[PDB]
Structure formats: C-alpha cells, structure tokens
Design an enzyme around this catalytic site. Structure first.
Site, short mmCIF file in Angstrom:
data_model
loop_
_atom_site.label_atom_id
_atom_site.label_comp_id
_atom_site.label_asym_id
_atom_site.label_seq_id
_atom_site.Cartn_x
_atom_site.Cartn_y
_atom_site.Cartn_z
CD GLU D 51 42.31 46.22 35.34
OE1 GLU D 51 42.56 45.08 35.78
OE2 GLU D 51 41.26 46.49 34.73
CG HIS D 52 42.02 42.48 39.03
ND1 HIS D 52 42.81 42.59 37.91
CD2 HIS D 52 41.44 41.26 38.95
CE1 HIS D 52 42.69 41.50 37.17
NE2 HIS D 52 41.87 40.68 37.79
CD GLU D 128 42.23 37.31 36.46
OE1 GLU D 128 41.22 37.41 35.74
OE2 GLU D 128 42.82 38.30 36.94
#
Ligand code: 3PE
Lengths: 418, 44, 51, 412, 98
Positions: D51-52, D128
């Site tokens: 997804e990233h 993150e």
C-alpha cells in the site's frame, strides 16, 4: 428541481431546494462571527457557539436535547471569523420540530446566568482540545499579528476572559448581530414554502441591519513562540484580495499552482512548486503549502511550512524564493491549467456532499444574496489567466508580511532576513 | 407510567423465580411436612 | 544597573535570596495543513476544527 | 427513489459495480479481499508495505509519474488497508472518468516495486511504527484484537511486527501481490456522476486480464477464528490518560442481527466512551472504548457493564425507537457524499456479495422491537467472556474475575 | 384572611429572628438547586440571615421589634427560582414516565 430564492421585506433570505432526499438539512446563516467583537467582549462568539443547547425561551434545555436525540437528528454550529451557521438535519417527518428547535435557538434565547456559568468550563475544555494541534495555534497567532482590530479577534476565547463573560454580553451580541437583514435560511430536502412559513414564526423579531463591524486594518509583524515542538510551524502571509474582487480567484489559482496540499496519501510529494523547490535542497521531512483566507473586506495569502527546527531556515527561504520566481513570470501555461483543474475539482468535491452544499448556498446567500451555479463558477475560474496569477504573487512578494512561528526557533529567520 | 410497566414485565418472571426459590427454600429448611408430605420422594 | 536604570532597576534583576498578596497556588484532554480555521461544535457530535 | 446499485461481473471475475447520481465528482475505487487475515506471519506487513509502495511507482508510470497525472486533472488519490479489505480509490471529475480507471488499472496490475523505493518505504513504515505507538486508542484496539484472537491470523496487525517490516523482499511482496490480487476477489466500484455502461467498457479495456490463476494451485483458504476471552494490561503510569476497550464476540457480516446490535449501540462518564461493533467475517467484536483518568476506570467499567445488562434485561420501547432513529441517520447515501457511497459498494460487493439498498436496511430496522433486542443482547452480551485491553495508568482497572462476574446480574 | 395571615406570620416567629420565609425552607434537592442558581448578593444575604438567626437561637434571644421582618416586607426571592427547578424536575420526570 433547482434552487429557489425569496428575499423577505424584513431582509431575511430564504433559499430552498427539494431533491426528495431521505435526510433533509436546514441551516441558518448569520453574519455574527468573531470579527464583530471588540476588546471589551472578546470570546463572546465562542460561548455563543457553545451555548446552542441552552434553555431557550420557547424550549427548555431538556427538550432541546431530548427532542433532537429522540428523532436521531443532529444540531451543529460552525463558525468562521465572519459567519455563524446553525444546522439541523434529520428525517423529513421530524424536520417540523427540528425547525421549531433551531428557530427557537436562533431567535429567542434566554441566556440564564447559571447555565453560562456551567458552560465556561466547557469553553476552557473546548479551547484546549482545539489547540491540541499546532496549526490552529499558528493560524490564530498569524491572524492576531496580521490584523489590527477586526479579523485579529480569535475564534477561541482568551484565557483571562473565561469567568468574565456574562449573560448581558451574550444578549447584547445577539440583539446587535442576529437581525433579519444579516440572516439566510437555507433548506435542502424541504419545500420553500415551509421555510417561508417558518420565517414568520421567528426571524421577525429583529429587523435591523445589526451593529456593523469595524473595517479590518492590516498591521504586519512577526511573532515567534518557542514551544518545543521539534517542528517549526511557520506561516508567512501578506494582504490579498477580498472575496469578491476578481483578484481573489487569481489568488486561489496561485495557491493551487504553488501547491494546495497533498493529493496522495503517504505519498504526497512533488505536488508543489513549493514542494519541489524545498525537496531539491532538503532531505529532511517537511510539509510546505500555500495558505489563503479571504474575508469580505480583506484577505491573507502566504506560505505555511512545517519542518525540522534545524532546516527551518533555508526551507522557508526556498519556499519564499519559489514564490519570487512566480513573481518574475517564471511559470508555464500547463502548470496554470493543472492548477485550474485542481481548484475546480476541489470546488466540485466540496459541494458534492450535502452539508458542504448547504454551507455553500448559505455562504453565497450572506455574501452576495445570490446563488451562483457551480457551472458559473467554473467559467469564472477559467477567467483567471496566467498573468493574473503572476499579479497576485507580486502582491504577496511585496506587501508587508505577517509571520507566526512556533517551535524551537533558534534557526528560524526573521522578516527582515526573510 | 407506561415505560415502567414494561420493565415490570421483564422482571415478573424473575420475581416469580426468586419468590419460587424463596418458597422452595422456606419449605425445605422449615421441615414443614405439610407441604412436603405432598412431594413424591422427600416425603418421609 | 545603578545609574543607568534607577527606578526601573528591580525589573531587570532577579534576586533570589536563596537561603535566608502571596502567590495564589499558580489540562489533559483526549486526542499538517493550510486553510482558514473553522470551528465546529455540535449538540451531541463532538467538536472539531477543519482549519 | 434512490437509484439502484447495478453490478456486473467480468470473465476475470472482478466485479465492476457502480452507482449513478447527479453529482459530477465520482469516486472510482478498487476493493480487494486481501488483508492481514490472509497473511501467514512470514509476510505480516506485505499489504501495508505494498500500500505504501503501490502509489510510488508503476511499470508504465515510472517513479512519481502517476502522482503527476493525478495532479494534472486535480484528482485525489487515497488508499487504505484493514484486516480483511484493501482499497485504492480516486476522487475526480466525471469527464476524467476513463484515465482514472486506467490509472487504477496500473495500481492493481503492472505495478512496479522499485527495490530502491522498497527501501525508502521501509524507513517510512518503520519510523511511523516507531511513532505509531503514540496513538493510544490504536494501541488499545490492537491489544484487544491480539488478546481476543490469540493464535489466529486475526490477532496480527495491518502493520505487522517490526521484523516482518524490516525483512521484506520484492519477491515476497510480489507474491502477496500475485497471490491476493485475484480478479474474482476484486470489485471496481463507482459512485456519483458515472454511467454504468461506460464504466463497464472501461473496465474491460484497462482491467481485463487481471490474474485469476494461483500458483501450483496454492489456492488460499480461510480459518474460522476463536474468540479467546482474555485481557492485556499494558501498564505505563507516566501517561496522563488511560484507554480501555472491552468487547465480546460479534456475529459477522452476513448475520442480520448485526442491525439489532447496531440499534443497541445507538442506545449506548469517563471522557470519551464510544461503543463499537467491529465485524470481520465469521466473527466480530461488539464492545466499548472508554478513556478515563486512572481513578474512574473502575466506575466506568461498572457503568458500561450496567448499561449492557440493562439492555439484556430491561429494554423499553422508547429507547429502542430512539436507537432506531439514530441508526436510520447513519444511512450512507449520495448526501453522505461520493467517497462514502463509493466505499459502501466496494465493501458490500466484497462482504455480502451484493449491494443492500437503503429500503432493505429500513425494513430490517423497523422490524426490530424491544423484545428481540433484549433477546439478541442476551445472546451476545449476557454471561459472555470478554476481551479486555488496557493501556496507561490501569492499576484500578479491575481484573478478569470482577469484569466477567459483573456480566451476570444475580437478580437477572 | 389578610389580617389572619399577618397574625399567623407573627405566631410563626421566624420574623423575630430576622429571617425571610424562603430562608425557612427545608433544603431538599430542588431547594439546593434553586439556592445554587441565586445571584451572589441574594445568596450572601441569605447566608448572613441564617447565621444571625443561628447566633440568636444560641443566645436564646430575638431581635428588637423594630428589626423584625415585616410580613408585608418579606420577599419571596427563592420562590421564582424554585418554581423553575420544580418545573424542570417534573418535565424530566414526565419524559421518563413516557
Ligand atoms: C387543648 C388542646 C388545644 C389547645 C389550643 C391552644 C391554642 C393556643 C394558641 C391559639 C390561641 C391564642 C389565644 C386566643 C386568642 C387569640 C386572639 C388573637 O389575637 O389572634 C387572632 C386569631 C384569629 O385570627 P383572625 O381573627 O382570623 O384574624 C387575625 C387578625 N384580626 O386567634 C386565633 O386564631 C386563636 C385560635 C387558634 C386556634 C389554633 C388551632 C390549631 C389546631
């Protein structure tokens, strides 16, 4: 059908659209933002915004809460520096009593002293929750340093004014700014007739034009508040056009050219002449965008940067230099066309939702008394042309700047250095 | 009130059970043999 | 700051005596971008700011 | 009078659904039945890292080419991943409908994972995760999922353990991509100013040939999870506030009493106290997420428990009517906006296999009365073993005997 | 009836302690809510009158006759505030009943 408008002889604007939606929304828009206070009644609009569920002349508090929650409807208050909007929404079979509750709240408050004395602690809690993020504090600081009297007033109540706002100040503010010539009642999913007929039960009490607000005066100035956040939130703005002036649009095209923010999640890079000009020199994490806030007499346009304290300087300089390039005519027509497409897509996605559509109609009503079809706007944004954009830029590049900074500001530059 | 009545209903069986439990317990502990002489096994 | 300030002196000179009205006893809440702020509060809907 | 959601199916198997409305800002979006539940603890962050990276680089659009295109029409590009579904959606204008679909086609197939890009993301994701711990409610809900679904693929997280994130191979990713991106497990959903016939044409041209055949017939399959009543008590007394989540097992997507349970949530001290009905496939977590100062968690727990039992024992018609009205305003629709309507379609075609119209939702809401609400609440809340997840100053948070026992009223 | 009410007001005897009628109300939940909603000056006069009456009852004295509370003068200040408390209280009760 289409939007349908009547201006009543007491000045109240009525706008309706019947689209046979299952949930219908009805909002009421007043020119009673925080710009209409002075130094003696600061924070009164914040307590007025938080005082929407207080015992009204017509309805006791218990009912104004238990009756809205009984049908599952929603009552909300949104406030800018110019405008307040009280919005109710619910099933079509309950919007009669929803209009009863909303028009009682707008037209006939009581403002009992024990109720506002209980509400001042909620005022403090709401201000703390709002200033939990750095953007809100830096925009409030930017407005306070940018303007002198009118638009410099904060949206949130100052710390000393808590405990000092009385019932008489709220009554004076309502009696001086909640008049029929400053109000528009806008209904999606309702018949125009009823709005007209609910505009007589109430909205007939105050027919004046209200106590008009002083003209906002620009002051300039740079304020820096060491707060520790590793990120130096810095906003540098200058005076720009008012909402109506054609120049306005040019400034909207200019922010969409210099970046309007991210368009991709977790991958919003190189989305801005600004972002490109920062990223070609700095490998640290950053977030650079263009800020534009235009009100009916004055506007602020500038740059907004979040960065690591250390690089905070040259990143800001890089962003500033990019705007200077746009002030020198260094732009391409494809970039301006992409900026126009981004701006018009943002406008259409802003009006594609029901509450955004109701807000837009509302704003247009108070602002120009007229509804501008989405289509009309599209061709006006198209009117903005390349040179126009350049022009607005030079306005920013020259006009006295106002700077609000926060964080570890040991390497954050000043305005005379910027 | 109307609503309170509904609450009652939901608790009527419950009350009955507790009352029934009370009744059973009372008879058992009291050794009352009148009622108990009217039960198949314990009788005696 | 003896001849330069005079009366203004005590404003530029902390004087903690160290060894050798009074202060009157001088919040935790539950848990970027650019656009003019717009505060929102609702009867039941939690408040919010969409800047 | 709400327009119906029309669903078609392509040979590939991907379902190109759609919906139409006067609006002109369509949200096209691809939903994929692939999440952390389909990962096998050796690729626990493959969906997140894809997804990233999916947005950052595709074979046809090299480097940041895609993000430029998307800028050129002024469209917005978003993606998200849950434990069961992955979504890639674009908000755009109506007249830009073809190219957007073509863009989405690249994002699902022909995507390019630049080993360099892989590395850059590794940093982003690791950092993150290294700062994600900051968000408490996310920590508490991850703890609740872990302790409620111990030993199953539903305990793991979308992000996955730091290790898996560090160790990822273009090939591993390629696998997840080539394994969980099959055409029969894909829905092309459109909401707003779109024509269904034009979208169906566009679908074939750009989204045909989507893979459908697994490797060596390694056809995935799924495990019905177990709801292990258990607790987790991450004590850290330096935090100012405490977050506590208590849940029981939910029914699932296809069980209609979900609607009744939603009404129960609409019926329901310690700062925030939101009720929730997380509902994965074949299981879910009905419950509550209450934050609170360390000295009131105890009372809150009791209050929460009290409310539940009240709903198991003493539900009246007025609160049921209020909950039905509150639910009937959570109906998603054109007025909710395209993106929301867009999303529903994708989730409705992935979970139910069809788009449930709002009239059927209204019928299932109006058939709910107080008696069946307290029956279903007694079925799902009364005398059940909960999963408890606490984070913060949680010493006064009661242990498992006080919570479980509090779930049964000695007076019924 | 007016003269007989004045005679009963003299026979009740709280005017000899300088009290008002609303000072003599038993502080239930509704009465405490009405007292909490009073303005600061009325609340301070009520607390001083109650303290003076308690001091006079301690010394088993009464006020001089010129300082008593004239029936005509007594002001029912808490009454207005109280009605509301009761009204609100009943409204809430009714809502629950239904
Ligand atoms: C044995 C057991 C019972 C014992 C009872 C003893 C009662 C003693 C206290 C009351 C009697 C006081 C002395 C009686 C004469 C009082 C004369 C007087 O000045 O008071 C007036 C009052 C009648 O009031 P009225 O005439 O309506 O109007 C007053 C203004 N003109 O006069 C009265 O009201 C006097 C009658 C009061 C009756 C109260 C009954 C309560 C039961």
């Amino acid at each position: 059908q289409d939007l349908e408008f009547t201006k009543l002889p007491n000045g109240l604007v009525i706008a309706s659209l019947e689209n046979y939606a299952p949930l219908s929304r009805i909002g009421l828009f007043v020119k009673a933002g925080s710009r209409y206070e002075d130094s003696n009644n600061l924070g009164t609009s914040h307590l007025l915004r938080l005082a929407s569920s207080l015992t009204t002349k017509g309805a006791s508090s218990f009912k104004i809460t238990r009756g809205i929650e009984a049908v599952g409807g929603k009552l909300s208050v949104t406030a800018t520096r110019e405008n307040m909007a009280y919005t109710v929404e619910g099933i079509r079979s309950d919007i009669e009593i929803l209009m009863e509750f909303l028009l009682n709240v707008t037209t006939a408050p009581e403002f009992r002293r024990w109720e506002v004395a209980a509400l001042r602690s909620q005022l403090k809690i709401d201000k703390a929750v709002a200033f939990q993020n750095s953007q809100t504090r830096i925009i409030e600081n930017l407005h306070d340093v940018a303007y002198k009297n009118a638009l410099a007033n904060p949206l949130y109540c100052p710390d000393y004014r808590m405990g000092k706002i009385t019932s008489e100040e709220l009554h004076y503010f309502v009696q001086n700014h909640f008049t029929s010539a400053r109000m528009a009642l806008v209904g999606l999913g309702v018949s125009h007739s009823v709005l007209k007929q609910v505009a007589e039960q109430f909205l007939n009490m105050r027919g004046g034009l209200g106590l008009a607000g002083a003209k906002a005066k620009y002051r300039g100035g740079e304020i820096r508040e060491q707060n520790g956040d590793n990120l130096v939130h810095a906003a540098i703005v200058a005076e720009s056009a008012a909402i109506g002036n054609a120049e306005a649009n040019a400034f909207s095209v200019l922010q969409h050219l210099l970046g309007a923010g991210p368009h991709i999640k977790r991958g919003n890079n190189t989305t801005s002449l600004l972002s490109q000009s920062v990223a070609k020199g700095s490998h640290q994490p950053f977030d650079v965008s263009a800020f534009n806030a235009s009100y009916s007499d004055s506007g602020l346009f500038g740059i907004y940067t979040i960065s690591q304290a250390a690089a905070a300087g040259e990143v800001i300089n890089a962003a500033y230099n990019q705007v200077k390039a746009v002030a020198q005519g260094n732009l391409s027509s494809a970039d301006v066309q992409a900026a126009k497409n981004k701006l018009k897509a943002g406008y259409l996605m802003s009006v594609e939702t029901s509450e955004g559509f109701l807000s837009e109609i509302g704003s247009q009503a108070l602002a120009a008394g007229s509804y501008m079809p989405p289509s009309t706007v599209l061709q006006q944004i198209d009117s903005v042309a390349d040179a126009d954009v350049v022009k607005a830029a030079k306005k920013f590049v020259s006009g006295k700047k106002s700077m609000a900074a926060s964080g570890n500001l040991g390497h954050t530059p000043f305005l005379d250095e910027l | 009130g109307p609503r309170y009545r509904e609450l009652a209903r939901n608790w009527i069986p419950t009350a009955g059970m507790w009352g029934t439990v009370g009744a059973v317990g009372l008879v058992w502990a009291t050794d009352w043999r009148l009622i108990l002489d009217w039960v198949p096994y314990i009788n005696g | 700051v003896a001849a330069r300030s005079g009366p203004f002196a005590p404003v530029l000179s902390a004087t903690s005596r160290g060894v050798a009205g009074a202060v009157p006893a001088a919040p935790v809440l539950d848990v970027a971008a650019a656009r003019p702020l717009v505060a929102t509060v609702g009867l039941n809907v939690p408040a919010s700011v969409r800047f | 009078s709400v327009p119906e959601t029309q669903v078609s199916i392509l040979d590939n198997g991907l379902r190109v659904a759609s919906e139409q409305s006067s609006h002109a800002t369509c949200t096209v979006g691809v939903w994929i039945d692939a999440g952390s539940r389909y990962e096998t603890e050796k690729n626990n962050g493959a969906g997140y890292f894809l997804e990233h990276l999916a947005f950052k680089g595709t074979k046809n659009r090299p480097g940041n080419a895609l993000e430029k295109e998307v800028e050129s029409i002024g469209a917005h590009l978003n993606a998200y991943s849950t434990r069961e579904h992955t979504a890639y959606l674009i908000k755009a204008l109506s007249k830009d409908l073809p190219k957007v679909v073509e863009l989405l086609a690249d994002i699902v197939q022909n995507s390019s994972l630049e080993d360099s890009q892989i590395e850059k993301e590794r940093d982003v994701i690791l950092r993150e995760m290294q700062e994600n711990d900051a968000s408490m409610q996310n920590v508490v809900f991850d703890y609740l999922h872990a302790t409620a679904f111990q030993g199953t693929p539903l305990a793991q997280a979308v992000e996955g353990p730091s290790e898996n994130v560090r160790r990822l191979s273009r090939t591993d990713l390629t696998d997840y991509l080539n394994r969980h991106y099959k055409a029969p497990r894909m829905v092309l959903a459109a909401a707003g100013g779109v024509e269904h016939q034009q979208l169906l044409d566009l679908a074939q041209k750009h989204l045909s040939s989507v893979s459908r055949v697994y490797e060596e017939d390694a056809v995935p399959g799924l495990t019905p999870c177990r709801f292990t009543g258990s607790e987790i008590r991450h004590r850290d007394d330096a935090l100012p506030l405490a977050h506590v989540a208590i849940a029981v097992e939910g029914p699932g997507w296809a069980n209609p009493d979900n609607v009744t349970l939603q009404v129960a949530n609409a019926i329901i001290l310690c700062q925030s106290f939101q009720t929730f009905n997380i509902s994965y496939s074949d299981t879910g977590l009905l419950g509550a997420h209450f934050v609170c100062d360390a000295m009131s968690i105890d009372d809150m727990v009791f209050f929460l428990q009290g409310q539940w039992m009240r709903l198991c024992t003493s539900a009246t018609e007025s609160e049921v009517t209020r909950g039905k009205n509150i639910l009937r305003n959570a109906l998603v629709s054109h007025l909710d906006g395209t993106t929301p309507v867009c999303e529903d379609i994708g989730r409705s075609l992935l979970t139910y296999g069809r788009r449930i119209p709002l009239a059927e939702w209204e019928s299932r809401i109006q058939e709910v009365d107080a008696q069946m609400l307290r029956d279903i609440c007694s079925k799902y809340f009364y005398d059940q073993c909960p999963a408890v997840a606490g984070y913060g100053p949680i010493e006064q948070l009661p242990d498992y005997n006080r919570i479980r026992s509090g779930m049964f009223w000695l007076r019924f | 009836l007016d003269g007989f009410r004045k005679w009963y007001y003299n026979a009740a005897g709280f005017n000899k302690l300088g009290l008002m009628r609303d000072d003599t109300l038993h502080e239930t939940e509704d009465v405490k809510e009405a007292i909490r909603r009073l303005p600061e000056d009325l609340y301070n006069d009520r607390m001083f009158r109650i303290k003076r009456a308690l001091d006079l009852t301690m010394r088993h004295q009464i006020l001089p006759k010129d300082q008593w509370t004239k029936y005509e003068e007594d002001k029912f200040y808490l009454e207005p505030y109280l009605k509301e408390v009761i009204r609100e209280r009943k409204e809430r009760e009714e809502w629950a009943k239904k």
